[PDB]
């Protein structure tokens, strides 16, 4: 229905200790398997104009760092916490996925948090290697990653081509290859509402770990040009079948280069998209733009309403708008005192599981726990509504970097002074 603007997801795939032992430490076979399923995933997202470029692989070999359990929710929360604590601090990426051989309860094969694409604690994925063929594997890879983009399980009467679609959830005798018409609108609504700015920029060609393949609309290091399928390449400067530059041309795909010739040094190629998104200028001898950078974290943003944190300006008002309604507002200071109780919903940190010692928040840290938002649209009771569910507990907690008080922001669930 629409040609969506071209977005690149940076993915990191982690293999569990159970999975690596199934292949008897044959890392080459695992790498080939991952590359094949990711090629299939890139093939199936072609109509969405979304590319999944693998950035790095993590091998938990001869050890494990999280308590992987048969319960999907527990291990999913544990992996999400571990990811947001270690992987983002160690490796820049957009999405993370765990590959495990441990069977899960109720025969569940994959699970992930919806709408969590750019979220630190909530962009995480769990998949079980249940198939001997890569096609059925990429089926549920695509299903879960589509969940993470805000697309839900397919509702009746949304069948595509008289065949079950990818968002069906339940198994089908032939594995399908296309999303339903009731998914394009959901993706568009997610883009309009949650505004996932973290997947707009393409990754550097030098950072890609996946081997180069011609025709996937991704420019890897080993190839001089990559425009996509030969039947789609409208750029005269390259031919996809040859996968080489047209004679007389100096560029293929890119942002800094324009009009099929390298632009002069000092010309802007990555414009400022936000208050703390400082622009970058071309190096003058490369078609790729320099790595995206932002202003120092801690600068005021959005009319002094918040502080920037890694290129984003988080405020409790925007989170309330996202959670409940376009007219939501942060609740009164009285309701944030409920986090002192350590109740089943009000807490700061808790042990992994349905049960767990939910630690009560500190008296000054009450505003870094749950987020309470006033909304009189649904019902006038519960003046301080909150969103909480055992599947996606982290949703509804204030994002790191939000302004708890003047001169202080919530870092690691604690209201601490800015520019310490």
């Amino acid at each position, epitope marked *: 229905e629409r040609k969506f603007e071209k977005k690149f997801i940076e993915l990191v795939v982690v293999v569990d200790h159970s999975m690596v032992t199934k292949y008897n430490n044959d890392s080459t076979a695992i790498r080939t398997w991952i590359y094949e399923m990711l090629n299939t995933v890139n093939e199936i997202y072609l109509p969405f104009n979304i590319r999944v470029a693998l950035v790095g692989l993590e091998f938990w070999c001869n050890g494990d760092l999280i308590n992987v359990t048969s319960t999907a929710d527990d291990t999913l929360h544990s992996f999400g916490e571990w990811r947001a604590s270690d992987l983002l601090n160690r490796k820049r990426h957009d999405h993370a996925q765990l590959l495990t051989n441990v069977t899960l309860d109720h025969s569940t094969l994959g699970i992930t948090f919806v709408y969590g694409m750019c979220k630190s604690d909530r962009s995480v994925e769990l998949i079980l290697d249940y198939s001997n063929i890569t096609f059925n594997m990429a089926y549920i890879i695509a299903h879960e990653m589509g969940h993470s983009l805000g697309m839900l399980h397919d509702t009746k009467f949304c069948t595509c081509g008289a065949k079950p679609c990818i968002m069906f959830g339940k198994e089908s005798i032939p594995p399908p290859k296309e999303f339903s018409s009731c998914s394009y609108d959901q993706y568009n609504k997610y883009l309009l509402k949650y505004n996932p700015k973290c997947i707009l920029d393409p990754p550097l060609r030098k950072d890609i770990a996946s081997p180069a393949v011609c025709g996937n609309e991704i420019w890897e290091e080993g190839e001089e040009c990559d425009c996509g399928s030969p039947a789609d390449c409208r750029n005269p400067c390259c031919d996809a079948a040859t996968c080489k530059l047209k004679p007389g041309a100096e560029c293929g795909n890119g942002e800094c280069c324009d009009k099929c010739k390298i632009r002069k040094a000092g010309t802007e190629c990555r414009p400022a998209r936000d208050d703390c998104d400082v622009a970058e200028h071309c190096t003058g001898q490369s078609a790729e733009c320099p790595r995206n950078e932002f202003q120092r974290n801690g600068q005021p943003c959005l009319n002094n309403s918040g502080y920037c944190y890694n290129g984003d300006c988080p405020i409790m008002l925007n989170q309330c708008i996202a959670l409940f309604s376009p007219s939501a507002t942060v609740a009164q*200071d*009285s309701c944030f*005192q409920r986090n002192l*109780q350590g*109740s089943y919903y009000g807490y700061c940190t808790k042990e992994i599981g349905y049960y767990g010692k939910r630690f009560p928040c500190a008296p000054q840290d009450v505003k870094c726990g749950r987020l309470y938002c006033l909304d009189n649209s649904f019902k*006038k*009771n519960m003046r301080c509504k909150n969103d909480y569910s055992y599947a996606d507990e982290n949703k509804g907690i204030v994002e790191p970097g939000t302004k708890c008080e003047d001169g202080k922001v919530c870092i690691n669930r604690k209201c601490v002074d800015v520019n310490t």
Partner: antibody, heavy 120, light 110 residues
């Protein structure tokens, strides 16, 4: 569990003022509005305004706007209600009804009730 | 007394079922459908049975059910026992100076 305990019964001649206290324990006192309910013997329940234990802001019913003043003590976790210029109609028992999580217009936990009587 | 109107008294038998009516104007009960019911034993503080017309807090028997029809909200009890010899009060949210108003109460004899 949530527990509410109030002061002993008082006898006041007409024209005086009465101050009752309600002690809250087992929960964060500042997080929940503290309503007051007044019941004459043999009659129905009457409502009195709520006090916000965090900010101290108070609302009063139209029947009591000129009579009641409500005060809090966060460091002790007690609420106070003052009723001045008592009249013989004000023979009743008083409960410090609390709100709760799923509804703000309903009261789950009530104090044991203190009885105030006014006569010659 | 208060604005909400309830029947003066009602009686039943342990092997029977009963209904208690609560009524008010459009602003009192009919409009905002936030009615809740209370039960009070002699000498004890009132206890909450149902809220939001039909919703019911945990820790009480299933014999207490609530429903709304126009301006009138009704409470029905089936299988009377010794616990039901108490007073029942109706309360509703009002869009006026008074935030919430209670009922006149009724006496139930088993």
């Amino acid at each position: 569990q949530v527990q509410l305990v109030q002061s002993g019964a008082e006898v006041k001649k007409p024209g005086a003022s009465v101050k009752v206290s309600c002690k809250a324990s087992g929960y964060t006192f500042t997080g929940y509005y503290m309503h007051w309910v007044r019941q004459a013997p043999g009659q129905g329940l009457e409502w009195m305004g709520w006090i916000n234990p965090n900010s101290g802001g108070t609302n009063y019913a139209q029947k009591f706007q000129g009579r009641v003043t409500m005060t809090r003590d966060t460091s002790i976790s007690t609420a106070y209600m003052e009723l001045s210029r008592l009249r013989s109609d004000d023979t009743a028992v008083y409960y410090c009804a609390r709100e709760w999580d799923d509804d703000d217009f309903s009261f789950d936990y009530w104090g044991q009730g203190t009885l105030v009587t006014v006569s010659s | 007394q208060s604005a909400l109107t309830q029947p003066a008294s009602v009686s039943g038998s342990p092997g029977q079922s009963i209904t208690i009516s609560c009524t008010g104007t459009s602003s009192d009960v009919g409009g905002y459908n936030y009615v809740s019911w209370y039960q009070q034993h002699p000498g004890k503080a009132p206890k909450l049975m149902i809220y939001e017309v039909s919703n019911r807090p945990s820790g009480v028997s299933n014999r207490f059910s609530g429903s709304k029809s126009g301006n009138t909200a009704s409470l029905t009890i089936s299988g009377l026992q010794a616990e039901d010899e108490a007073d029942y009060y109706c309360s509703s949210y009002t869009s006026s100076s008074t935030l919430v108003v209670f009922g006149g109460g009724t006496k139930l004899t088993v």
